[PDB]
């Protein structure tokens, strides 16, 4: 299957906005880690691929993503980046959790129906 631009971007769109909408647990993935004012010098250490939800807007709305699996794997990837990181208990980490359940209930329908 061949998949049309703005076709796929439709489709995913209202997961992506699912995600962005949770208040607060959306809060730290809106924009990249910036590691400089975030006093952590360590973190693209321990994080080689960063990703975010404002990156995947741009991605998702400037042709990146040819098929929905490489959306998929962005969005795991933003997720799996604060798992690794962050302790468990951590705001982030609980956030990241959370963001992930609402992942999985959004995506499988629309990954059903392609």
Do not use: H
């Amino acid at each position: 299957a061949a998949f049309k631009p703005e076709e796929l971007r439709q489709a995913l769109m209202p997961t992506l906005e699912a995600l962005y909408r949770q208040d607060p647990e959306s809060l730290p993935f809106r924009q990249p880690v910036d590691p400089q004012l975030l006093g952590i010098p360590d973190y693209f250490d321990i994080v080689k691929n960063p990703m975010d939800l404002s990156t995947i807007k741009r991605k998702l709305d400037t042709g990146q993503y040819q098929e929905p699996w490489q959306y998929v794997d962005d969005v795991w990837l933003m997720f799996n980046n604060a798992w690794l990181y962050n302790r468990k208990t951590s705001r982030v980490y609980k956030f990241c959790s959370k963001l992930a359940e609402v992942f999985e209930q959004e995506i499988d329908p629309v990954m059903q129906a392609l």
